[PDB]
Amino acid sequence: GCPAEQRASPLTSIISAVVGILLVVVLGVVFGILIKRRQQKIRK
Amino acid sequence: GCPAEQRASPLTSIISAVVGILLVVVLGVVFGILIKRRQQKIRK
Numbered sequence: 211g212c213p214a215e216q217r218a219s220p221l222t223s224i225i226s227a228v229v230g231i232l233l234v235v236v237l238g239v240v241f242g243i244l245i246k247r248r249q250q251k252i253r254k
Numbered sequence: 255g256c257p258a259e260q261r262a263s264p265l266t267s268i269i270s271a272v273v274g275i276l277l278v279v280v281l282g283v284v285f286g287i288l289i290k291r292r293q294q295k296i297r298k
Contacts, residue, residue, distance in 0.1 A: 214265055221261035222269050230274035237278065 245252075289296075 217263060217265035217269065219261060219263075219266075221258055222263075222266050225261065225266050226270040226273040229270040230277045233274040233278060234281070
């Protein structure tokens with residue numbers, strides 16, 4: 211079902227970091243634009 | 255100097271995801287507490 215003996219390679223770091231940094235940036239962009247469109251008064 | 259033949263294992267995904275999700279959560283906590291402590295009026 212879940213054949214895996216765990217890992218510990220260096221390449222895993224670079225890849226793991228890229229993913230995290232990618233999700234972060236994408237979040238900031240969305241949030242910014244979101245708050246921009248919604249403008250002031252966010253509760254109606 | 256940089257001995258690496260690239261990777262492509264599954265374990266890399268689970269690890270990469272955890273890192274990204276970990277950085278995100280940590281960010282939210284900091285931001286929330288930050289804005290909370292700073293309270294209204296953030297420019298003095």
